[PDB]
Design a protein around this ligand. Structure first.
Ligand SMILES: *[C@@H]1O[C@H](CO)[C@@H](O)[C@H](O)[C@H]1NC(C)=O
Lengths: 48, 48
């Protein structure tokens, strides 16, 4: 969840008002991108 | 909603709603709403 109300985007889009949904949406994006960055960095080290 | 002896706050009445189909239009038209602050879900899309 990374601190949001739920981990399913389809669930959190039909359970909140659009002006407030963005706050919970803009946590999944950052968690996913940090996970992706960690993955790519370890992959670069392994490739070296 | 059409009760006559809503219990006091010190001993709040609790009812269980299950095995039915919910259409909150009756809830809308059976009260001159003064405060409808819904938190976990948007009141607009409440019937799906
Ligand atoms: C039920 O609702 C109607 C419409 O507001 C009202 O006239 C009636 O008194 C209510 N019945 C009870 C038992 O409160």
């Amino acid at each position: 969840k990374f601190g949001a109300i739920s981990s399913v985007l389809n669930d959190i889009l039909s359970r909140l008002d659009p002006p407030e949904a963005e706050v919970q949406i803009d946590r999944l994006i950052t968690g996913r991108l940090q996970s992706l960055q960690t993955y790519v960095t370890q992959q670069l080290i392994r490739a070296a | 909603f059409n009760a006559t002896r809503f219990a006091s706050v010190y001993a709040w009445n609790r009812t269980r709603i299950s095995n039915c189909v919910a259409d909150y239009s009756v809830l809308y038209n059976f009260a001159p709403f003064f405060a409808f602050k819904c938190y976990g879900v948007s009141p607009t899309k409440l019937n799906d």
